[PDB]
Amino acid sequence: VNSFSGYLKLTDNVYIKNADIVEEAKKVKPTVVVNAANVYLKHGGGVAGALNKATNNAMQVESDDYIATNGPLKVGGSCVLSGHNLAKHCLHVVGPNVNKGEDIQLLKSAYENFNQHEVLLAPLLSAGIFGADPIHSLRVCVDTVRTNVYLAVFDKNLYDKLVSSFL
């Protein structure tokens, strides 16, 4: 038993809700919140901009030190950093950004990072400003992640569409 409330169950291990991942995180304080990161951990907009703002920019400060030490992530890769006031940990995961021409097949590799964590609160990778089809992203999530994933979908309209088209 865990504290996630109001999710629709899609599969044995994947759950979905219409929620602001930021407000979902502040209430649940999950062990892991997933950020829709880029390789530079520049958290300017989309989910990343919203998460970072909710930490009062502490996420960005920590991220800049991480990059200064380690260099950029790989597309399809991830790193674990602090969850600040939102979660114990933040798993920064880089899905491909279609608006940069990145290969969509890397979306599966991105979701594989979730399997290193028993339970996660997460957005749909490569959705929103990353330019991928959220329905494809949901399919890859279901077909790749084996651990327990609670997906927060900000837009009520897309949420309804994802549920209604889910196979």
- Transcribe 39-106 into DSSP letters: TT----SHHHHHHHHHTTTHHHHHHHHHHHHH-PPPTT-EEEEE-TTT-SEEEEE----GGGT--TTH
Shortest Cβ distance from residue 51 to ligand WVM (Å)? Answer: 8
Return the number of the residue (37 or 81) whose C-beta is nearest ligand WVM. 37
Return the number of the residue (96 or 128) whose C-beta is nearest ligand WVM. 128
Residues 17/5, Cβ–Cβ less than 8 Å:
no
Helices (H) and strands (E) in the chain, counts: 6, 7
Please give the angle made by the CA atoms of 62, 71 and 84, to the nearest 5 degrees: 15
**Using CB under 6 A, which residues numbered 125 to 164 contact ligand WVM?**
127-130, 152, 154
Q: Which of 34, 41, 50, 54 binds ligand WVM (CB under 6 A)?
A: 50
Shortest Cβ distance from residue 12 to ligand WVM (Å)? Answer: 23
Q: Report the distance separating Cα 8 and Cα 39, nearest Å.
A: 31
Shortest Cβ distance from residue 158 to ligand WVM (Å)? Answer: 8
Tell me if 36 contacts ligand WVM by CB under 6 A. yes
Return the number of the residue (69 or 126) whose C-beta is nearest ligand WVM. 126
Return the number of the residue (6 or 69) whose C-beta is nearest ligand WVM. 6
Shortest Cβ distance from residue 150 to ligand WVM (Å)? Answer: 11
Segment 65-72 long-range contacts (CB within 8 Å, at least 24 positions apart): 66/41, 67/40, 67/41, 72/39, 72/40
Shortest Cβ distance from residue 131 to ligand WVM (Å)? Answer: 8
Tell me which residues touch ligand WVM (CB under 6 A). Answer: 20-22, 36, 46-47, 50, 123-124, 127-130, 152, 154
